[PDB]
Amino acid sequence: QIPPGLTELLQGYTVEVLRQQPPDLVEFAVEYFTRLRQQRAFYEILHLPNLNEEQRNAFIQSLKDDPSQSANLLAEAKKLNDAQA
Amino acid sequence: PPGLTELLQGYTVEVLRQQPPDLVEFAVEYFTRLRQQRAFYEILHLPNLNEEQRNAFIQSLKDDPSQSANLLAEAKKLNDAQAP
């Protein structure tokens, strides 16, 4: 069945599309959802308790430099976190 | 906006069909694919590039998505400048 939370997400995209009147809805979609994805990625990396500050800033800067790698790179963060605890 | 409903509807349909683990990740994925489709379409509806010339820009878009507007300007500056 329909995933819980899809309606809120698509609603946010629609809201920003109406507020900003982008010339390309597809490009604005890629932009919007890439920004949203990196936002939650920063959220995960910044909330993992067992990482330290050099690791935290290293993953955040690493996400800045190479964004597409995010889900690949944040997976590393989880596997670097499960270590210490 | 013209085309919003078809866009959101296609995304939702594919979300049900594929059940991705992350809706945001799948959004980036799906809409990047759509953007490349639109770019291929744009290149493909230029009247005064010719056929073999037309394929070359598509190959440029096949490799990495990050320099599209240059190819739209170059094609737009090549065709409306090539013929009649």
Numbering used by the authors:
A (entry chain B): 2 to 86
B (entry chain A): 4 to 87
What text appears in the publication on this structure?
Here, we propose a method for generating proteins and protein complexes with complicated shapes using fusions of alpha helices. To design amino acid sequences that can stabilize the alpha helical structure of the fusion sites, we superimposed one or two turns of terminal alpha helices of connecting proteins using a molecular graphics program. Then, the amino acid residues important for forming a fused helical structure were chosen from the two natural sequences in the superimposed region. Our method does not require complicated computer calculations for the design process and can be used for the assembly of artificial protein complexes with predictable and rigid structures.
The third example we chose was a fusion between the protein kinase A regulatory motif (PKA_RIIα) and the protein A module. For the helix design, 6 amino acids of the PKA module were superimposed with the N-terminal helix of protein A. As expected, protein A was connected to the PKA module by a continuous fused helix in the crystal structure. Because the PKA module forms a stable dimer, this method can be used to generate forced homodimeric proteins that may be useful in designing artificial protein nanostructures. (b) Crystal structure of the PKA_RIIα (dimerization domain of the regulatory subunit of protein kinase A)–protein A fusion protein. In comparison, the fusion proteins PKA_RIIα-protein A, MrsD-protein A and DARPin-protein A ligated by the shared helix method have negligible structural flexibility at the fusion sites.
